[model samples]
Target chain A: PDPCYDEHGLPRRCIPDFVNSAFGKEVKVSSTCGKPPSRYCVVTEKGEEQVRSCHLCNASDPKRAHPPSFLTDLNNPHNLTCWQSDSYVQYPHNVTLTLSLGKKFEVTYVSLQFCSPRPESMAIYKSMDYGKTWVPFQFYSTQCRKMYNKPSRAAITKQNEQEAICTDSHTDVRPLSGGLIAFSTLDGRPTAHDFDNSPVLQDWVTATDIKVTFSRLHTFGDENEDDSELARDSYFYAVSDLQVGGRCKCNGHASRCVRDRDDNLVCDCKHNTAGPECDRCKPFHYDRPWQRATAREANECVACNCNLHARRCRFNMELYKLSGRKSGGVCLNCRHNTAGRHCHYCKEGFYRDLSKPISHRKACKECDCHPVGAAGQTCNQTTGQCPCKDGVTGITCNRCAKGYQQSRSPIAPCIKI
Target chain B: GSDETRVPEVPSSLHVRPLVTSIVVSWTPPENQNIVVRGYAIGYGIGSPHAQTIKVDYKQRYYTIENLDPSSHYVITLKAFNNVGEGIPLYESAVTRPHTVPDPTPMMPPVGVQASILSHDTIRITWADNSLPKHQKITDSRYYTVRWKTNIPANTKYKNAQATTLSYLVTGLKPNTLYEFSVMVTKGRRSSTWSMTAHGATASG
Candidate 1:
């Protein structure tokens, strides 16, 4: 019932069919946080604890991870105690977390929670072809700045009393940065706050294998300045937990499709194609089945045989009906008096060798017409001869007939002198 | 001069229109006129012989001064002449419009100028005319002048070319030299400022 929905009853933000294959799958988690004491921690008197390290860091530690707690932790109530990273790791360190969903997936969203204090930057990456190559996942983030890290209870209470962070329209999203999440923290505890800037409702990305690299972590001071041992060892990039979400909604092969920023599905159509589905061919290369693709009967989109002169080609249904066979889109809209399906032949008033096939791209020669000596501008379409006047003769109508004197005219005609 | 002639009253509502190389002067007859008006004498210019005079028929109240320098200011006076004497003269000052060939040049320069290399020795340039304002739609004959110069230091002078159409092809240029080009519109004797310059390099043979 949405106004923008098409006849297919599909919304402009329609999820691709492959999403069913990709979403809500069993994801295997692995992290470089394999060593213990890889974090700094503070045990609270309220029987609560806080860890400051990368997301999913120190996975084996009962205090750092809850196992089976992965993405579900992101959806749990803020008041619920969940997994946290070590707070005592060296200020900034490389923490790479990999999520393999057993198979490829069209990942649409990845969620994360920053502990009381947050890191300066976080980079998220994806590798469709396993981990051989990683590409930055282009997801939208609101206010690349880090939100206030008030105590969990105070933050939760304030968030509840205030309005939703992100509105329903989801307009507050921006593209990812080199798989980086650079944080600019604001210095204030909110008496009144809105979730709009919070990562409560984060933007989604389409990926297969997700890798998050947390970097630029350090205590509150400049890394270049000399610091007391306490200042040097105190800072960290901490996370409560991280979640990955999306669906395998690609059309043909799931690997070929990607969800762009606007959430519409797109496919990497080979041989120059426009796709979410490869229903049409590329501009100028109108010869359908132009090139063969191994994946299907219609392989690569091939170039139209316009002899490099035509601007474009169209699949003319009328011509196809006349041909009574498959391939029949003529290459029309030729330049420079060219005419033919592939623009390989010339129009009337032009002539070319009959021995050469029209598809050979041989240029046609213009008929040699004498203004007053020739009957008209048009000549035989096939032959390169002009019609001579009564008093004119010669293959080109360039000579005057006998008994006729050459007239003193620019047209070079003959007169009975 | 006849004794029956009396001094005519002063001319009223005088108007002056400055044009390219000329000024059109007009005025209403004096309100209180009780004399036999012979004719009118219009004098205008900056000085001396240039400040010449013209006499018009008794029924005429306007005159056109010609052969004036473009963009030059001139003082104009008109008096009703009778048999006895000339009436009180009315004066107005006006400056002729500035022009490249004459005065009152076109309003704007040519727009959308483009240049492309055609061959080792030739380059093509094209542009579109600047449209006239709607309220002021006077048709004028116009042409284009193309100017181009090589980037090299020794090229002190630019190649000058003329064209009547929007597009023109320039030939006989050194191969493989970076050159800058511009276009100007000329409406009759008056020309506009040059268009934004465009640059292109000729292909090497």
Candidate 2:
């Protein structure tokens, strides 16, 4: 979609040599393509008519997770191991898992989710090599058991569920390695004597080929819980606001909404359109059809200064906080008859006079700006020039004094008494 | 006999002004002193008639005498010296007054002297404007005083007491009254007898 065609159905992209019918207009185009990752622009006509054209590709944006492959039941088998000897390096209880996309990546994140209440004591292991050697890893936790939402997803938790994973936001962000009850004994005997725990601490060198494994010995038989299995059928991924466009958690039916990474409309459908704005507009607006160039997402259904007559929707210069992300801001607008980005600053020929009628007088050319010396705006048609009182000088008088300095001509004075 | 015998000239015409925390003394070299003089020295003290002298570096002729009383008068002297001997002293006594701290002085405005009306109701008087006295053409004046008294009689000292303020208005007398006022001037601590009287009156309503 980066190089979109014009109404003629011709690929009118903004690349070198591409021109438009309009005068003094240039064209530039770019698309979000990962493969070959290239950008191109064309300047057909130049000057004020310059137009910038760009687009994003489907691959440039990806889905967070494919629909969870609805398997009748868990397909992947799970395993557990304990140290062979207390003196045999004490199960080498420690482990670490370091995920590196290398370039300090963003989507390239790691998540650890534990299905069972955390063990009273457990350790994590890590390996730079393919599990050949292992080292200690870390997890976020205190010396307490973690809970999860139920109908206990895990079979053993269905009977003695004290808490749920959804109980708190912190409890929910638990790492896969931590907050799970791992055991040192099975059937009243030390389980570490049966296996090599070091192998559990392993890794793959590159990000493209991802591999994740878990450690921590969960001794069954310490309680009535069953040691059936540890199911890690869960998944994680990332998507952006644009990818999760109108198809997000929002729906006109709901009052509130949330959209995930896929751009798929979950229709939290009960509510208004998901994404930022809760309301929708016709095809050209929020919930509109895809056009060559799209209008930025609407802040919300809330009408702004642009509600009346809009020359354009823009941030009020004096009031905007230049820092941080550009998002919902209290916009300023022109009063009834006026139109401009800074609503307070009048347009050409329109004079700001408190003495005139409350409403603007269209035919009042006496107040129109003068044409000489830059743009002289204060010239009064009736008076020609009150010499543009208040230090504003020029043929029409549209600026402030030039400041004090030695001058051959009479010096322009400041406006103070 | 010491062949290098050269009589040093008397130092005079000295004037000292306060700079920051020290007194800056500027003086005219004695006419007879040898022009080969290196620099000068200054010393001062209170409760004493003279100041102690200290040697000064050659490049600087101006000397700062410090650690003097901020509110007391001190006698300052400048002596330019050469290898032969120190020159005569240039003498001037200056009172180092404290700086003004703003707010109005109980009876007077901080920058302007206070004017008041004494005794006899309805009688009026004004002093000569001397706020910037130093800039005035008055010759060699160091201090000034102003005074005024009632309409008791003519040529009586009690009727006109000397005061140091600009204007004074005295009231309460036989209705439709008239009062005479006069001023006394001083120069370098010497008083002038008097000036012809100026007259003003209050409305008898």
Candidate 3:
């Protein structure tokens, strides 16, 4: 069993769940094969052309689909169940592939398994603002120094751990068809354990878009330039799987995020907060200032006493300081016939029934006056006393006046009784 | 750093964990060592004469071996290697959990099959039956059959369909509903028992 706190009484953050976001999601690529039913090399008997895709140009064939959609089909097998690039006229064999997430995510790793020979060199880039701009995340090459003018697996220090690195590893094209290239975003960082306070690593893993650039294709030096057509068929990129493993960026608040009807990501917004990313507290729950959750005492917006009188409230620093920091929420447009900054008084034709508690819904009682004896309809809200003529009596001005004979005829004024 | 060639101590407390389709091996690092270890070598094998080896970095404490036969035993050997030579090797045996149907019947089902959502109202069921018998290509005489239904007991309903291809698309599904699906090889009203069940849910509408 997993407990929220340790036996020694220290809080623990139950990390959010991870997912393979690329599953069944589209990956935009530079090009695809089989437009004219492209040809490829018969590896056993090289120089012989193979044409199993002749009818793929005319029909929608599932078994023959080598399009980029295969990258996310989840049928991850090392066969024709892959996304292959065009090579019939392979002038620019280099390619680029991009996948955009529905929302910002804290990415942990990116992995790819190729069905064709893995590229001789490749680089990964990430974008935080919907791919409007990108930052180089990592670079892999057989000759990292010569190709990228960068050192291989550069040493990382505590000060520069957020920066990316170039590596000669995972760039080899051996075991040709089923090679895997994986990038662990934090495997070598220096301060990975201090993630709670280290904003650098947090910001480094935040990305909304991922892009891959394949710069060079693997080949034997013997393929001829005179008959480039024969060799071109064997030098294209193919990938059977592309998986991004990570979870939503929820500020350690919610356990899950839901998808809306339009396929937009929506946060569950726990801790009595509301925002697309849990950035603020709810309206009536403004007792405490908005604070981000942490591993210790994780969460939570505390419930406020708005007296059930106002439909809206806002935190005021003045009221917060005046009360020494409790009951800072200033009530707005008070209801239930009550009106005040904190909703302790009554409205204009009503008076506070001091006998009941202020939290009671019927704390404010209504006031009425006699039409003939009273001057007007309005009355004092606090005392429940109506404005009457000098000779009139009674709290509502309904009784007779002093030293006057009361009469039943019309009972117009404070005259004869 | 040392001028003389030396190897580190043997890694201790070797633990072999068998998952559904892979074996995870972990070990405690050697301490009180006099020399720095450069790397480690992992050797694994199945039945008679089966052989494989891979080198791992010194910093890595665990590695997962994937792409193994379901419900099979494998013997693994781990050793520390440095500039000089290799240290004493540690050996352990583990068996992967069963993924395919355990009981063998007269009817043989395919080995590898996966179901995934293609759209809000459609899911694709694909099988690796090419290695099996009879169903060689999409043009085979016998067709494949699929069984699928909603997981909701209150609104549950079952249905079966057929396609002659290696994979079939199950359609007319409700958006964002959990469905359990199974497929079998069928010929002339005689079909194999339903293959292992795979669960999936449709995307949002």
- Report the C-alpha displacement of residue A154, candidate 2, in angstroms: 24
Interface RMSD of each: 20.5, 24.1, 16.7
Report the C-alpha displacement of residue B72, candidate 3, in angstroms.
29
Q: Is candidate 1 or candidate 2 better by lDDT?
A: 1
Give the per-residue lDDT digits (tens) of candidate 1, residues A1-417: 432233764322222233333234333443323256453332212234323222334556665544434433434454543333334444235555566654344454465554434444445567756567776542222223332212222232444432212111111111111112321111132531332233322121334577765544433432335434334334443344555544442222223455578865455444455544444577766554332222223244555667666768887656656767355567767766668887777777777756655544456667756544577767776667788877776556544565664443424345674
Between prediction 1 and prediction 2, the one with superior TM-score is: 1
Please list, in the order the candidates appear, how each scores on TM-score for chain B only.
0.48, 0.41, 0.45
- Among incorrect, acceptable, medium and high, the docking class of model 1 is incorrect
Query: Model 1 residue A194 lDDT?
Result: 33
> Which candidate comes out best when scored by lDDT?
3
lDDT of 3 by residue, B1-205 (tens): 4322556666765778887889898976666455667777776655210157777988888999888777665666677767665564565656677655554444666546688788998999888664355655644366678889888874556799987777889889989988888778866545577788788899988
lDDT of 1 by residue, B56-86 (tens): 8778867788899987888988888777778
Estimate the lDDT of model 2. 0.33
Query: What's the TM-score of every candidate structure?
Result: 0.29, 0.20, 0.55
Which candidate order results from sorting by lDDT in descending order?
3, 1, 2
Q: After superposition, how far is residue A312 of candidate 1 from its true place, in Å?
A: 2.0
How accurate locally is residue A53 in candidate 3, as Cα lDDT from 0 to 100? 19
Candidate 3 C-alpha error for residue B27, in Å? 22
Cα lDDT for residue B85, candidate 2: 76
| lDDT tens per residue, model 2, A1-417 | 322233554332121121111111111111112343322211122453533222222233333111111111122335221111111011224222223211100011233223222222333333333335554322222222441112212222322221112111222322323232221111122221331221111111111111222223233211113321211101111111000001111211222233447652222321112222222422212221212111122122222333243333433333433523332223244455443442443444454455543334432334433221123444444344534544445444433334511111113322322
